[PDB]
């Protein structure tokens, strides 16, 4: 149907905008601490601690399959990156501190993304 196409175009354009959002958030992680999944070879107990691991590569795979239906879904996955780290790692670690800086800087980007998603529909 033509309606299904229109809906698919909307999803494509959201995907476009989320790709730009993802690039901007990942720039706020210049150390690449959040770039890839935590390695279960190197942290074998991880899944005992963290039930829903997340990282920027995994988000990018989901994004490119148009797997985010709305901005809330995408933000859920970004918040997992931050929140997982802030639980597993102590306050006095470079990992925790990187997550705080990513959360603070990413807030700015996400605030305007929400306005754009609402504005363009």
From Swiss-Prot:
Sites of the Glycyl lysine isopeptide (Lys-Gly) (interchain with G-Cter in SUMO2) crosslink: 41
Residue intervals of the Bromo domain: 9-113
Subcellular location: Nucleus; Chromosome
Residues spanning the membrane: none
UniProt tissue specificity: Highly expressed in testis.
Record note on quaternary structure: Component of some HBO1 complex composed of KAT7/HBO1, MEAF6, ING4 and BRD1/BRPF2. Component of the MOZ/MORF complex composed at least of ING5, KAT6A, KAT6B, MEAF6 and one of BRPF1, BRD1/BRPF2 and BRPF3. Interacts (via PHD-type zinc finger domain) with unmodified histone H3. Interacts (via PWWP domain) with dimethylated and trimethylated 'Lys-79' on histone H3.
Function: Scaffold subunit of various histone acetyltransferase (HAT) complexes, such as the MOZ/MORF and HBO1 complexes, that acts as a regulator of hematopoiesis. Plays a key role in HBO1 complex by directing KAT7/HBO1 specificity towards histone H3 'Lys-14' acetylation (H3K14ac), thereby promoting erythroid differentiation.
Identification of the protein by name: Bromodomain-containing protein 1
Organism (species): Homo sapiens
High-level lineage: Eukaryota, Metazoa, Chordata, Craniata, Vertebrata
Gene that produces this protein: BRD1
Parent-protein residues present: 555 to 674 of 1058
């Amino acid at each position: 149907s033509m309606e299904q196409v229109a809906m698919e175009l909307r999803l494509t354009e959201l995907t476009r905008l989320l790709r730009s959002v993802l690039d901007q958030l990942q720039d706020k992680d210049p150390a690449r601490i959040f770039a890839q999944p935590v390695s279960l070879k190197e942290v074998p107990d991880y899944l005992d601690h963290i039930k829903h691991p997340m990282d920027f590569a995994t988000m990018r795979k989901r994004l490119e399959a148009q797997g985010y239906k709305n901005l809330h879904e995408f933000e859920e996955d970004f918040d997992l990156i931050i929140d997982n780290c802030m639980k597993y790692n102590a306050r006095d670690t470079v990992f925790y501190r990187a997550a705080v800086r990513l959360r603070d800087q990413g807030g700015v980007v996400l605030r305007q993304a929400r306005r754009e998603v609402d504005s363009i529909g």
